[PDB]
Structure formats: structure tokens, C-alpha cells
Amino acid sequence: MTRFALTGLAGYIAPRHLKAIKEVGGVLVASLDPATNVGLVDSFFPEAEFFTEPEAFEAYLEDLRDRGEGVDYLSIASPNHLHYPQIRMALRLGANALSEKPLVLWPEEIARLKELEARTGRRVYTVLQLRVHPSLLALKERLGQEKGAKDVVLTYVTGRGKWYGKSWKVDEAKSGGLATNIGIHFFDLLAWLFGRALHVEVHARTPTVNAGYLELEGARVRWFLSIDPSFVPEPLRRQGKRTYRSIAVDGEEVEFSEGFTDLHTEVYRKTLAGEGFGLDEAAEAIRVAALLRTLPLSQPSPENRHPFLG
Amino acid sequence: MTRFALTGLAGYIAPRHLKAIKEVGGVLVASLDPATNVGLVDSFFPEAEFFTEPEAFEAYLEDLRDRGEGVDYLSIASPNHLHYPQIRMALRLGANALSEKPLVLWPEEIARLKELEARTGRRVYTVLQLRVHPSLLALKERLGQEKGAKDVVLTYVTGRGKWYGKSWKVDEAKSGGLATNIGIHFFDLLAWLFGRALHVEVHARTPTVNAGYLELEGARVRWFLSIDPSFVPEPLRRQGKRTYRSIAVDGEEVEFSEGFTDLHTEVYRKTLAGEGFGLDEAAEAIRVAALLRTLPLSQPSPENRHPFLG
Amino acid sequence: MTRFALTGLAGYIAPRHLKAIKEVGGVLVASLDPATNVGLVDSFFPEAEFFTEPEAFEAYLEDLRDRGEGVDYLSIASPNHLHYPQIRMALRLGANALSEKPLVLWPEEIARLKELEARTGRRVYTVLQLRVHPSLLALKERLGQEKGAKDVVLTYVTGRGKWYGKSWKVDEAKSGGLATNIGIHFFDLLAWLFGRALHVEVHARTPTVNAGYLELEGARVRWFLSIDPSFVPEPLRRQGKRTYRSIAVDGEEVEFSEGFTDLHTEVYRKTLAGEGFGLDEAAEAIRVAALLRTLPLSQPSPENRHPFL
Amino acid sequence: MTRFALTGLAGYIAPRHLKAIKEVGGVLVASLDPATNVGLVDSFFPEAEFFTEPEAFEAYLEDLRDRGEGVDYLSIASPNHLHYPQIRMALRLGANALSEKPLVLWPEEIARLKELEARTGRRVYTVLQLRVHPSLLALKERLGQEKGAKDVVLTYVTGRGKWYGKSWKVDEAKSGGLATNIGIHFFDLLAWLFGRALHVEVHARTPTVNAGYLELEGARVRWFLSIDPSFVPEPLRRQGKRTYRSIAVDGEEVEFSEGFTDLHTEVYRKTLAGEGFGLDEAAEAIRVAALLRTLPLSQPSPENRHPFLG
Ligand SMILES: NC(=O)c1ccc[n+]([C@@H]2O[C@H](COP(=O)([O-])OP(=O)(O)OC[C@H]3O[C@@H](n4cnc5c(N)ncnc54)[C@H](O)[C@@H]3O)[C@@H](O)[C@H]2O)c1
Ligand SMILES: NC(=O)c1ccc[n+]([C@@H]2O[C@H](COP(=O)([O-])OP(=O)(O)OC[C@H]3O[C@@H](n4cnc5c(N)ncnc54)[C@H](O)[C@@H]3O)[C@@H](O)[C@H]2O)c1
Ligand SMILES: NC(=O)c1ccc[n+]([C@@H]2O[C@H](COP(=O)([O-])OP(=O)(O)OC[C@H]3O[C@@H](n4cnc5c(N)ncnc54)[C@H](O)[C@@H]3O)[C@@H](O)[C@H]2O)c1
Ligand SMILES: NC(=O)c1ccc[n+]([C@@H]2O[C@H](COP(=O)([O-])OP(=O)(O)OC[C@H]3O[C@@H](n4cnc5c(N)ncnc54)[C@H](O)[C@@H]3O)[C@@H](O)[C@H]2O)c1
Ligand SMILES: O=C(O)CCC(=O)C(=O)O
Ligand SMILES: O=C(O)CCC(=O)C(=O)O
Ligand SMILES: O=C(O)CCC(=O)C(=O)O
Ligand SMILES: O=C(O)CCC(=O)C(=O)O
Ligand SMILES: [Cl-]
Ligand SMILES: [Cl-]
Ligand SMILES: [Cl-]
Ligand SMILES: [Cl-]
């Protein structure tokens, strides 16, 4: 029975973690969130300890550890800028970390975490559910059979209501900006499929749209990211869809929205089986996303312009 | 299409109000919550406006009024002490109010609300789902047949985890205390069935237990309230059950937990149909609960002592 | 005895408002702040009500109004995005408003307040302390005696520590951005002295520097604003100074640091006498600051580039 | 040059700590507060780091420690329940702690901190400025010359406006209650003069008044504590005084309000000189204050009743 603590319990994504912990036969020992709108927790783990103050949470988990009943994992569902320091808290307390994406905001934070693993005997893992999406695992096998770099069009639209622009998600110091907070999913998919980015361009940047181009070891990629649902293709909009997440490559197209929200238990299962996504796996997309925070806009060549900018 | 604005969107009970507004064919025009952990809202009303600052939400709703697009109803799912001033906001904005229980904390607030309903021509309503619970409607009908007052044992145990003690729920200025925040359900049930309280006693009053006695026009009632699930009767507790909500009238048992969390849409419907629970309906249980904040403890006679007290 | 309520009581700036209210013979009936380090209030108005919830503060003031004991002014010292909706509250409660700068963030908000003033017969005022100052007030009479366009270089560097970057003051939706949160003082001084901005350019807009160029009816202005103290001129910086606040008009300087934390009381007095700074006085700087946060960057000509760039 | 970090920078007492660090020739390296009303700091330590997130503050200080540049002291001016876990943070960072009163809330926390001191070779100190108040030091000397149990009337009135009741200071879980948050000063003065409390009674306990009776090894003590300035004696009220802090014993009375707010630098100097008030010194008043939280009210005998209750 794997022992978990959880940060960010009051949040949107937290119930998916509570479900994962239940489904892998784990127990939630304690949670942290400065907000107390967490009453849903009793329907999953009615005996879990709860803290509003991170310093009190830390002291409690240390007391559990300084006596043999420590947690095995800290699940981290706090705002992005808190992932790094809460992962360090976990490792120091003798727990593995399982952090939401992006694992951290900066490449310097990845480098420091690699050193800290070696001094604490624990490991840092991250939630990248696209890496367990059955359609994308199948695409990955297909693409591996083919020599040469591929040409890819990546379109990632996921609608967000008006609350998003009043939240931490649009504070770049907290979220990393749109290309990190939302785009890390696809920058990570592209690194997993096609390796390291040799060249990066950004062609459009507004509060709701970013678009650009990547030259990766295995592919040339035109990409478009939005949180404005008007960019969902019209035939799908008609049927009420608010998302469109598509990779077109090698003469095929895979739209990977189905089950996007139903893969957190599989990520937990892979992680507890020792097949999790660690620092080495997460680092490349974080490097790309971080470069994009400060990269100047450029004018795309026609070959490099995503079609939604045409 | 009834037009609603909602306060308390990030909270535990908010999704039941989103489901109710949906199911009655209403539209959520705008919501208010100082917390922004509200991403669930896009799965219901992906175009609703959102505010963290009450002053800005008010100015926005005042602008809508002034241009003939005012909201019809403010639904209120904020902490209890904010119900009164949020209902004052609804009324001044030219909207009706539908507030979670307890409707307000104090009888003086009920009295001032009556004045403001007269000044504004608007109405104040509240969510008391026990009044639409089919077993309790059935009970009320059977009691109408009967002559004389009844002897009643009311036992109300609903377990709460460790987060509750770190929330506004235990700040008596915010919540009104245990007998208000949780007990209002049953004080209101008893007022609805049995009328006004002629005499009130409190026999036990700790952070997790209140017990006492009421003499009502239609009943003598021994009551016990707890948020410690250890008080669930042993034959249910041994199975892991954490709630027990029972009214026993002249020795006949009605346990009413089933469907307790599945009646908000029916309250909303009754309200919109002119059958809502207004100030006059809610006032008596508020008067009882408010008395209980300062009523001195007394030693029960054996005939007035709830069985759980020994 | 003029009755006041105050918003933003916990904030850096509220003590000058407590002094003005005291000094002008007013009484503070109630205050609002989400935060609770407001104890200083006890040494001025030891009986004032206090609220952390805006809706409870509004209901309390509305009760007072309805029984004929309403406040006469709402003084507003909250973060900038709250000024507009708190002035709206003041007018709905039948009070005048006296707001910190910037009075509101957007010209559309000014227009709405003008409608609402007419509806309620109450007035919106703002604290423009540079306008009652001795050394800036000196200019306006002189300058005004001469004709011809002036050539102005405006430089303001006011160092801010690491806390600033973690506060609402860098959230553009809350503060209006650097030029507004720092700038607005001086854009208002410039509009006061030299009229409407007929051309506006922004040359730099980074998190610690905003710089640009204005042409006003009465002057051209090269301006530079920063909260990075490394831009304090070296003869001051070498001494450890972290601020520098200069307007040079046709080669003639005035530096501005001295009477800066100073003149809230006179502004209260003028306002109470019917000589306050209203929407019409405030609007132009608000229009310019709204452009300064929204216009695209452009590359300056040599002639139009502030020397510090 | 003694290196400090500070918690609670945006609050009421912090400016006194900034002044103290400056006056003892220290440097403030970094500060933590979730609130950002802190601009004052620039007039003292213009280059200090600042954090809103405790986990980021702790990671920053951990980095300093690891590269041989750790702070020497953590000064703690956060809410009272945070003192214990922030002192734990200091000790694990290899810093001494200098915490505002009360040092911690509970005797069990004192006991844990004694164990952690021994582990780390760092020390915990606290601000008890009455122990450096010249009038009280002079009184202590005068009393010493005697022998036999003293008879004491302690009256401690310190006015607070309406903001206090909407702050953390009235949340007993955060502040310890009135007898702890305000009262610790005088319980500590009494323990310093007269030793262990062998008998404790509480006679009144309202939001603005606590009163009771103690018998200590060296004195019997009738005490009264209020934040209602109406209890300042009329003659002092008539001249506008809002405090009255009086100890009457041995045929004299010492009123110790003068300079009560001007002794923080002296506490810092004593602490840096190795003459600070440690766990052993602070423990007894913490034990007494904690007992008073749960002690039921009793009816006083006339002899044991503070005069202000008569
Ligand atoms: N597909 C996915 O894998 C997916 C989807 C959504 C969000 N996320 C990620 O999950 C995280 C949570 O996002 P969300 O949408 O639930 O955001 P949210 O704003 O709904 O919830 C964030 C929670 O963090 C809490 N918080 C703030 N500071 C904290 C601290 N010091 N400790 C603990 N909790 C703290 C907030 O009070 C809040 O309840 C982010 O890292 C986000 O990128 C991932
Ligand atoms: N069976 C029932 O009918 C039932 C069950 C649970 C709760 N309730 C009631 O619903 C209300 C909410 O309880 P909850 O359990 O959801 O609590 P909660 O603590 O989960 O959520 C409360 C929400 O109110 C928000 N809030 C705080 N101040 C606000 C303001 N000024 N405006 C708008 N929002 C504000 C908080 O940020 C939070 O998201 C309470 O009145 C409670 O009694 C009813
Ligand atoms: N020289 C000047 O005249 C001068 C100097 C500084 C600031 N200001 C202005 O004064 C105002 C205060 O800035 P500050 O420096 O005190 O920042 P601040 O962050 O120190 O003060 C913040 C106070 O406002 C509060 N607040 C947030 N929401 C509120 C609400 N809905 N109602 C009332 N209060 C609320 C916050 O809790 C905070 O405690 C701003 O408009 C700023 O532009 C003017
Ligand atoms: N005479 C004295 O020695 C004296 C006088 C006043 C207060 N105090 C003590 O000083 C402490 C502060 O009291 P105050 O009056 O300044 O209260 P306050 O409410 O004015 O200030 C409290 C500060 O703590 C901050 N805070 C909350 N959580 C924090 C955290 N995790 N880390 C750091 N900061 C955090 C708050 O945001 C706030 O700015 C308390 O322990 C109090 O008992 C002592
Ligand atoms: O909806 C998406 O594609 C992104 C989900 C996510 O990771 C987020 O919202 O943070
Ligand atoms: O569970 C219950 O019976 C009470 C639900 C409720 O109203 C509450 O938690 O506020
Ligand atoms: O320091 C300055 O010059 C600007 C003051 C100001 O208005 C602010 O800080 O918001
Ligand atoms: O004023 C006093 O005597 C006590 C000071 C205070 O508030 C405190 O110590 O928290
Ligand atoms: Cl906690
Ligand atoms: Cl808002
Ligand atoms: Cl309030
Ligand atoms: Cl931080």
C-alpha cells in the first residue's frame, strides 16, 4: 500500500490524483493547500491529515519519517513555480516526487534536482500523460520504422474560459507563460518522438495564441497553440468540441483528445512500476519552453509557417 | 432562460449549483470567487464571465442592469457570514437571491432583509433540500393526520475530515458554529414539521458534538449533532459508514441520507416556480440556531437527554 | 465634521490619508482591507469599524446612508484596478470619492463615472499632490507667462527592491504596468503644464524600464522611467542614492524628490473647499497611460530618444 | 556581520526587527511574507531577497547553506502557530532562531525543539522585552532581597480596535487565544519573578477580557487582561492613555508601559551576546498559557478575585 502526500488538493486537477492514488491501491496520508475548499477529499480518503501552511506540512512529514511511517511519494499539483521547491521538499523527506507538468520551469532547476536525487536516494517523476496515450504510442512505433526526418504540423487548441486570465496560469513568473503551461504537453511529445531542438522560432505571440517552428533531430515542425476555442476546426466546433489536439506527419494525422483526461491512473501505474518519466525524460521540453519565454518574434518563411497563420 | 450569477464558484458545493442551473435551463452569466481554482466551470458554462473582486463583479452586474441585460438571480455559495451582504448586493442590483443554507446568520439580518425586499421589490430564497426529500415529505403528510404533539429523537452525524477544522467552517463568526453550519438542516426540518420552539436547551457543546432538547409547538425533541463519525451507530460504523441522519417519531425511524446530495436541482425548480423557501420559511431555524450560540449549558433531566448522552 | 470611509488601510500609502482626515477635522467611520496590519488606525480613529469583506463594508455603509448618517467621502487607497469599482461603490452609496492615482485605469471608465456623477449629484476626486507643490507649482505660473513650445527631458528613477516583482504592482491587469504605476504622476504633471498628447511613442517597455517620447500641444518630451537604481546618475549613485526625479525644461532643471511624501492634506483641503482634482483634470494622463501600456514599441530617431536609452 | 533572514516582513512588528538588525550591525539577506506590503525594507536593506512562498524561501536558504553562505539567524515575526515550524526550518538550515513571543504555542513543541537544538548545535531564542525593561529589572532586584511568598495584582490592559477581531489574532488555533497572544508577556514576567505555577484558575473569558488567579512557588497572583481600553483607570483615560500594564506587589506598584515598544534592539543585542531568552527560559509561561486554553471557568472566592471583577 503505497503512502502518498499531495500538494494542491483544492485545485482543478487534484481529484484526478485522488482517483489515481485510490486506483493504484495507495493511501493519501496528508495534503497541503493554503485554500481550504477541499471537502471532496472525504469521499476518497476521510482520514487524511490536512495543512494550510507548507512549514507545518513539512514538519509533520518529517515527524512521520523521523519515526518509520514516512510517505513514499509526494504528488504535486500546485502552481508551476512551486513544483521545483516542493520536489526538493519531497526528496529531503525521503519521498519520491510525482509532479504535475511542467516538471519544473527552468533547465537550472532540472540540473539542481539531478544533484539532489544523488544526495537523497529518491527520484523525481512527472505527469506527461501523452506518453501513455495509446494512439501516440502507436504513432511512435510507426514513425520508428521509417528512415529520414519527418515533416510535422502540430495544432493544439484547448479552450479556456474567462477565469483563466485572472489566475496564476497567466502570471508568467508562476506559470512559465502559455507555451509552458499548456504547450509543454506537445513540446514534450515532440521531444519524445523526434529528439532535441536544433533551432526554434516563434512567429506569433498573443495572450491566447503562440505559433512557431522547430527543427528537431528527427523532424521539422510547424506548431500552433491556442486557448481560444474558435480555432477548433468548424466541423468539430459544430458538434460542440472545445479542443483539437492534432499531429500530422508522414502522410497521416492523429487527433489525440480522446482519453486525454483519463490517463492519470496509467501514469501513476507506470511510475510505481519504475517506468516513470524522470528528469532526463522531461528536460528537453523544459529547455525549449524556457527558450521561448524570451525568444524574439521572427517572420516565418513560407515553408515554416503553420497553416493557421496562412 | 433565467439569467444567473453565482458566488463561491471554486467551492465544494458549487458544482451542484452549476448542475442545477444547467438542468433548469438557466444561463450562468458571471461568477465571483476570490479563489481561482474554478476550472471545472468550463465543462458547464464555458462563456461565463469571472471575477475575483466583489466590487468589480458588482459594477459589472450593475452595468448589465443599466443596459437592460441584468441577471434575474444571484446564487450564493459563499461562506455563511457573506450570505447576508451578498443577498444585500443581489437586491441592490435588482436581482432575486438564492442562497445556500443557512440563509443568513442572525434574526436581525432576516428582519433587515424583509425591509429591503419591500424597498426593492425583489425576493430572497434559500436552499433547504430536506424540504424536498421524498421520505421527509412523506413523513410530513403522515404527521398531518395525527393529533397531539409527538416525541422525537433526532440524530445527525455527518463525518468531517481534518480539513474542516482548518476552514472557515469552524470560525464561529463566519459559520455561526456547528449548530448553525451543520445543524440548520435539522433545526429547519423540525420547524417545518413541528413549528416554533417554545423552549430550547443545550446539554453538550464541544468542537465536534452539540446535543440538546427543544419543545416545539408540535413536538418534544431530543437532538444530537456530530461531525465525528465515531457516533454513527455501531452496526453501520462497522461497515465503514460515516453518516447517520435519523428522525425517530413516536418510535418510528426515518433515515434520510439516501439522496441527500441529489436534490439541489429540485430546490432550484421550486424557487423558479414561485414555491421557494423565503425569509418567512427560513427564519425560525435561524432564530433557534442563533440562540444556541450563547445559550448556557444546562444539565438535562433524564426525560430530555438524547440517548447518545447516556 | 466630514465623515470618511477608507479602502486600502493596510497599504503603504494609507497613513497620509489618515493624517489628512485627522488634520482636516474629519472622522473615519470605517475602513476596508483584505489584510489586517492596520493597527496604526487606532492612534487616529480608535473607534473606527473595520472590514475585510467588501460586501460587508458596503452593507454597513448602505445601512448608515439609509438611516441618514451616511459617509460624505470614500477615500480610496487600494490597488489601482480596484479604484474604478470602489468609486462606483462610493457613488452608489451617495458619497463623493477621493482616490489615489491613477484615478482609474481606462478612458472608458472616466466616461462612465461622468455619467454617474450626473445621476447621483456626487463627485469623483483624485489625489494629484504634484499640483499643489511649491517647486512644481512654481513652474506653472512662469512657464505660463512665456509663449512657444518647450523642449523637455523627464527622468525618473526610483529604486525598488525584490518584493516589487512579486506584488500586484507588476501585474499589468492590477497596476496598469510600470509607466502607469510609477509614470502617472509625471504624465499628469506634463498634461497639467503642456496639454494634450498629440503623438505618443514607446521605445522601451521591460519589466524595470519604460521610455518613450511625447509631443504635447505645448512641449515635446523625451521621458525615461525606471525602478532599477543603476540608472541613478553616477555622481549620486556613487553615494548610495537610489532615486532621481528630474524635469529639465529648455535646459533648466527642477529635481523633485523633496516634497513627495508630503501633500495629501492640502489636497484634502482643496477638495473639501470645492477646488479638488476631478475627472476632467485627471482624464488626460489616464488616456496617455492607457496608450503607454497598449501601443506597439517603435524605434526612436536620434532626436527623439531619451539620453539614458 | 551577522546574517539574518526574516519572516513576517509585511506585518506590524517587523519594522522593529528591521531596525534591530540594522542597529546591531547585521544584514538582512532575505525575507518571507505571503503579503507584499513591505516597501519599508528598501530603506534598511535595499538588496534583500524576497519570497512570498515559504518553500521557495527555504530552498533559497538551503542553497546558501550548501555553498557555505548560510544565514546565521532566522528572525520570526509570523503568526504564532507558525513559530514552531519556522524555528524547525531555521535549525535544519543550520541557523539560530530568534522568534517573537510566544516562542511556540505548546509544551510539546518546546520539548521537540530542545531535541533539535542538541542535534544541530544551533539555538532557539525569543523576544520577551519585559525581561529587559529597566523598571522590571529594578523591581526584580528589589524583590530579591526578601523571602517568603509575595502577593501580586497584575493588571494588563492594551487597547485594540475593531481590526483585531477580524485578524488571525482571535483565531485560537493561530494565536493561542487572548491569554497567549497578549497574556504571554505577563505570564512570562510572573514566571521569571516567582517560578512555577502550582495552581491555576480562570474566572472570566470573553473576547476582550480574561481574568483569573495563580499560585506560583513565590507568589499568589490575581490577574486581569483586556484589549478593551475602557478598563484603563479613569485618571489615565482622562489623559488619553490606551494601555495600563501594572504589577502591584510588596507594597509598591510598577506601571511598565513606558518604552514597552522600544526594547527590541536591546533583546537582539542580548541575544547576540549569548544572553538571550531560550527554551528553558520561555517554557514555563508557555505551559501556563496552554493550560488556560482548556481550563474550565471557576467561581472565584472574593480573596482570589481580581479587583476589576469586583
Ligand atoms: N493535463 C494535465 O496533466 C494537467 C491539467 C491541468 C493542470 N495541470 C497541472 O496541475 C497543476 C494544478 O493546476 P490546476 O489546474 O489544478 O490549478 P488550480 O489553480 O485549479 O489549483 C491550484 C491549487 O494549488 C494550490 N496552491 C497554491 N499554492 C500552494 C502551495 N504552496 N502548496 C499546495 N497547494 C498550493 C491553490 O490554492 C490551488 O488549490 C499545475 O502544475 C498544472 O500545470 C495538469
Ligand atoms: N447540503 C448543502 O446544502 C450544503 C453542503 C455543503 C455546503 N453548503 C453550503 O454552501 C456554502 C459553501 O460551502 P462549501 O462547502 O462549498 O465551502 P467551501 O469552503 O468549499 O467553498 C467556499 C467558497 O467561497 C469562496 N468565497 C470566499 N469569499 C467569497 C466572496 N466574497 N465571494 C464569493 N466567493 C467567496 C471561497 O473562495 C470558496 O471557493 C456554505 O454556505 C455552506 O453552508 C451546503
Ligand atoms: N505617492 C503616492 O501617491 C502613492 C505611493 C504609493 C502608492 N500609491 C497608490 O496607492 C494605492 C496603494 O498602493 P499601496 O502602495 O498601498 O500597495 P499595497 O499592496 O501596499 O496596499 C495594498 C492594500 O490594498 C488592499 N486591497 C486589495 N483588495 C482590496 C479591496 N477589494 N478593498 C480594499 N482594499 C483592498 C490589499 O490587501 C493591500 O493590503 C495604489 O493606487 C497606488 O497607486 C500612491
Ligand atoms: N511586543 C511584541 O513583542 C509584539 C508586538 C506585536 C506582535 N508581536 C508578535 O509578532 C508576530 C507578528 O505579529 P504582528 O502583530 O506583526 O501581526 P501581523 O498580522 O501584523 O503581521 C503578520 C505577518 O505574518 C505574515 N505571514 C503569514 N504567514 C506567514 C508565513 N508562513 N511566513 C511569513 N510570514 C507570514 C502575514 O502575511 C503578515 O504580514 C506574532 O508572533 C505576535 O505575537 C509581538
Ligand atoms: O487541456 C490541455 O490540453 C492542457 C491541460 C493542462 O495541462 C492544463 O490546463 O494545465
Ligand atoms: O452533510 C451534511 O449533512 C451537511 C451538509 C452541509 O450543509 C454542509 O456541510 O455545510
Ligand atoms: O516613487 C514614486 O515616484 C512613485 C510612487 C507611486 O505612486 C507608487 O509607488 O505607486
Ligand atoms: O500591547 C501589548 O502589551 C502586547 C503587544 C502585542 O500585541 C503582542 O505582544 O502581540
Ligand atoms: Cl496547517
Ligand atoms: Cl475581478
Ligand atoms: Cl468583514
Ligand atoms: Cl517566492
Automatic annotation (TrEMBL), chains A, B, D:
<keyword id="KW-0547">Nucleotide-binding</keyword>
<feature type="binding site">
    <location>
        <position position="100"/>
    </location>
    <ligand>
        <name>NAD(+)</name>
    </ligand>
</feature>
<feature type="domain" description="Gfo/Idh/MocA-like oxidoreductase N-terminal">
    <location>
        <begin position="3"/>
        <end position="125"/>
    </location>
</feature>
<dbReference type="InterPro" id="IPR052515">
    <property type="entry name" value="Gfo/Idh/MocA_Oxidoreductase"/>
</dbReference>
<feature type="binding site">
    <location>
        <position position="83"/>
    </location>
    <ligand>
        <name>NAD(+)</name>
    </ligand>
</feature>
<feature type="binding site">
    <location>
        <position position="12"/>
    </location>
    <ligand>
        <name>NAD(+)</name>
    </ligand>
</feature>
<feature type="binding site">
    <location>
        <position position="55"/>
    </location>
    <ligand>
        <name>NAD(+)</name>
    </ligand>
</feature>
<dbReference type="Pfam" id="PF01408">
    <property type="entry name" value="GFO_IDH_MocA"/>
</dbReference>
<feature type="binding site">
    <location>
        <position position="101"/>
    </location>
    <ligand>
        <name>2-oxoglutarate</name>
    </ligand>
</feature>
<feature type="binding site">
    <location>
        <position position="86"/>
    </location>
    <ligand>
        <name>NAD(+)</name>
    </ligand>
</feature>
<protein>
    <submittedName>
        <fullName>Lipopolysaccaride biosynthesis protein wbpB</fullName>
    </submittedName>
</protein>
<feature type="binding site">
    <location>
        <position position="13"/>
    </location>
    <ligand>
        <name>NAD(+)</name>
    </ligand>
</feature>
<feature type="binding site">
    <location>
        <position position="160"/>
    </location>
    <ligand>
        <name>2-oxoglutarate</name>
    </ligand>
</feature>
<dbReference type="GO" id="GO:0000166">
    <property type="term" value="F:nucleotide binding"/>
</dbReference>
<dbReference type="InterPro" id="IPR000683">
    <property type="entry name" value="Gfo/Idh/MocA-like_OxRdtase_N"/>
</dbReference>
<feature type="binding site">
    <location>
        <position position="156"/>
    </location>
    <ligand>
        <name>2-oxoglutarate</name>
    </ligand>
</feature>
<feature type="binding site">
    <location>
        <position position="169"/>
    </location>
    <ligand>
        <name>NAD(+)</name>
    </ligand>
</feature>
<feature type="domain" description="Gfo/Idh/MocA-like oxidoreductase C-terminal">
    <location>
        <begin position="155"/>
        <end position="206"/>
    </location>
</feature>
<feature type="binding site">
    <location>
        <position position="181"/>
    </location>
    <ligand>
        <name>NAD(+)</name>
    </ligand>
</feature>
<feature type="binding site">
    <location>
        <position position="168"/>
    </location>
    <ligand>
        <name>NAD(+)</name>
    </ligand>
</feature>
<feature type="binding site">
    <location>
        <position position="158"/>
    </location>
    <ligand>
        <name>2-oxoglutarate</name>
    </ligand>
</feature>
<feature type="binding site">
    <location>
        <position position="129"/>
    </location>
    <ligand>
        <name>NAD(+)</name>
    </ligand>
</feature>
<dbReference type="Pfam" id="PF02894">
    <property type="entry name" value="GFO_IDH_MocA_C"/>
</dbReference>
<feature type="binding site">
    <location>
        <position position="101"/>
    </location>
    <ligand>
        <name>NAD(+)</name>
    </ligand>
</feature>
<feature type="binding site">
    <location>
        <position position="80"/>
    </location>
    <ligand>
        <name>NAD(+)</name>
    </ligand>
</feature>
<dbReference type="InterPro" id="IPR004104">
    <property type="entry name" value="Gfo/Idh/MocA-like_OxRdtase_C"/>
</dbReference>
<feature type="binding site">
    <location>
        <position position="185"/>
    </location>
    <ligand>
        <name>2-oxoglutarate</name>
    </ligand>
</feature>
<dbReference type="InterPro" id="IPR036291">
    <property type="entry name" value="NAD(P)-bd_dom_sf"/>
</dbReference>
<feature type="binding site">
    <location>
        <position position="33"/>
    </location>
    <ligand>
        <name>NAD(+)</name>
    </ligand>
</feature>
<feature type="binding site">
    <location>
        <position position="245"/>
    </location>
    <ligand>
        <name>2-oxoglutarate</name>
    </ligand>
</feature>
